[PDB]
């Protein structure tokens with residue numbers, strides 16, 4: 001239907017180039033490791049235990065492979081603990097394909113001091129553009145590992161001036177290389193705005209996935225976003241009633257409405273799970289346990305798909321969402 005148009009490079013995973021057909025069932029938004037900005041300053045008591053993270057992540061990778069998932073797109077921002085070399089370790093040890101990102105978190109929670117400083121002194125947008133293009137076409141941090149996607153994020157109330165520097169640089173790398181763009185939206189807002197801004201800047205809608213769209217429960221919101229021709233991702237499936245996220249029941253209700261309206265070619269599914277936290281492992285208060293109970297990477301394969309199927313979603317629609325769409329968007 002709507003295929004990518006323009007410059008295009010082969011999907012780049014942490015262990016190298018992969019043919020679109022080799023992508024297979026994919027979870028489009030996950031984090032093997034993740035650390036909120038500041039975690040590095042807690043290194044004395046929250047050090048990274050490499051051998052333990054490697055064993056724990058390889059184990060999650062193997063379970064994903066057991067479900068038939070061959071690929072995970074790691075959406076971790078550059079300022080949130082991103083580590084391509086660790087990701088490659090996990091990929092080499094298990095055979096699970098992993099793509100990583102190039103990009104910064106949103107203004108509300110990212111490490112924003114650096115680039116705001118750069119922006120006050122000069123043209124931050126060019127510096128950001130140059131970083132993204134380098135990481136996507138040459139490699140990250142001298143490692144030879146390239147980012148297979150650009151990650152963008154924005155705040156609840158507006159795409160801030162700080163965030164726009166990134167949207168503009170990303171659009172330019174998108175136009176030049178064809179690399180896909182996945183995003184974060186805050187609390188169910190700005191999806192239409194991100195799609196509008198990115199398309200108006202010349203980025204290809206067929207190579208754009210607006211994320212955290214499950215954060216809004218009014219289907220008209222998803223529909224206005226989808227009008228732009230972009231894909232949307234229900235990507236925090238399993239995280240319930242936390243930070244006001246809705247329940248999975250709410251998400252599936254919107255999702256089956258959209259599936260019923262013919263939107264399969266534009267819907268992607270993920271959990272935004274964190275397999276291993278950077279910093280001190282988080283202590284989840286008693287009360288919060290249920291909100292995170294289904295928040296792990298086997299939740300869609302074991303619970304959501306069977307649920308969609310029994311509700312009448314067809315095998316073909318599930319295939320389109322988990323295999324067709326990722327094949328087109330990232331390959």
Ligand SMILES: [Co+2]
Pocket residue numbers: 029030031075076272
């Ligand atoms: Co995420």
